[PDB]
Design a protein around this ligand. Structure first.
Ligand SMILES: [Zn+2]
Ligand SMILES: [Zn+2]
Ligand SMILES: [Zn+2]
Ligand SMILES: [Zn+2]
Lengths: 233, 233
């Protein structure tokens, strides 16, 4: 199986191995600092740790982790410009955890600057939808994403809640279904979906609980291992 | 039950709660970056995360974590000078994970510079003893620690293995007994000891398995909650 969006730096080896033995043998960990950086260079190191240490720490437990890098809105360092430079260099698998939160202009810039660069490197993005204005925010996101004419195959709206699944559907981007509740199975009415537990720092087995609830069986293989097409693997 | 030396940034909430329910309701997490920094400022943020986020993440699971800051030898950033400045400012509970590894002069300087400053702030230190030359190294450490005339109540040699417990005894510093094996109980022949599981990124319940093995009972309260005197709390 496979589980996009899952913060590794917030999981212990024990928790990790629980994934190995449950089917979740493939995950996509995204960059995220549980506190706002004082220096933009920090992110770089969080990246170094995320792509040179985490994958081993994971495979050693029996899980093939696919790292993702970027800059979460809740931790935008001052000279965020400094973090896009290092990025525009090294080759990447995908831009993880990026988006808007308080619709601040600061996010828009840090968000745009990234999704923009992403278009020049043809690398996927996992935009994140806020928990607060998960409807007033996704609009703006889906609005920013609109202008750049971002290809409907390089972005995935995540945390697509029950009362907004219509909004993102009016688009051609991929929709991420986070189980965290479990009544998302019925949301299979239609096929640009992906199951993600989003196992963070705070249980960590939802990308299979409902990933299996689908009595529709077989077909389901495109909600669990459909994130491999998006994530080119 | 208290457990000094325990890397939090490498534990999951699940793993954390296991501590809460086993007696280990008090721990001392130390700073450590699983990869060598590219910038000295990174450390600062790892500190920010370690003293403004980790303690909550822990108490939310039922454990009172006592953060410790410093610079591990296996992750000495270039301008390490930059990390001692920020340190000589904010107030601290203790200097965690510092020491020598390859006896390099670079460590000696990063190690000395710290233990030195520590003497000016009267803050405890948890020196770490290498796994390789755990005998050729601890000597130098115990040698550096000698010159500075470091008070025998502000430092604790850790990972004091069975074949070196005599070396550090010839001193007045505190000895840290890491269970990781469990045949350390017999090492109670004498009372400057502390049980530490050292639960890192890679199970995490040794500061009680042997912390209880002591049939000597009662007295034991000075091997489990004797780290409270050293950490002053
Ligand atoms: Zn998110
Ligand atoms: Zn997330
Ligand atoms: Zn150590
Ligand atoms: Zn350690």
């Amino acid at each position: 199986y496979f589980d996009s969006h899952l913060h590794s730096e917030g999981l212990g080896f024990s928790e990790l191995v629980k994934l190995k033995e449950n089917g979740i043998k493939e995950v996509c960990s995204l960059a995220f600092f549980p506190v706002k950086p004082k220096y933009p260079q920090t992110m770089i190191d969080v990246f170094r740790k995320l792509t040179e240490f985490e994958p081993l720490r994971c495979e050693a437990a029996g899980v093939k982790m696919h790292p993702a890098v970027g800059i979460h809105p809740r931790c935008i360092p001052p000279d965020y410009e400094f973090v896009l430079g290092y990025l525009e260099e090294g080759e990447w698998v995908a831009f993880g955890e990026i988006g808007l939160e308080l619709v601040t202009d600061e996010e828009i810039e840090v968000l745009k600057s990234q999704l923009e660069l992403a278009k020049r490197m043809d690398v996927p993005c996992i935009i994140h939808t806020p928990r607060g204005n998960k409807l007033k925010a996704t609009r703006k996101t889906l609005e920013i994403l609109e202008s750049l004419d971002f290809p409907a195959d390089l972005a995935v709206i995540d945390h697509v809640n029950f009362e907004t699944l219509d909004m993102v559907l009016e688009t051609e981007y991929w929709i991420g279904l986070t189980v965290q509740d479990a009544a998302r199975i019925v949301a299979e009415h239609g096929e640009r979906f992906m199951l993600n537990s989003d196992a963070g720092y705070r249980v960590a087995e939802a990308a299979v609980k409902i990933e299996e609830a689908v009595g529709r069986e077989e077909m389901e293989k495109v909600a669990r291992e459909n994130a491999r097409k998006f994530l080119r693997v």
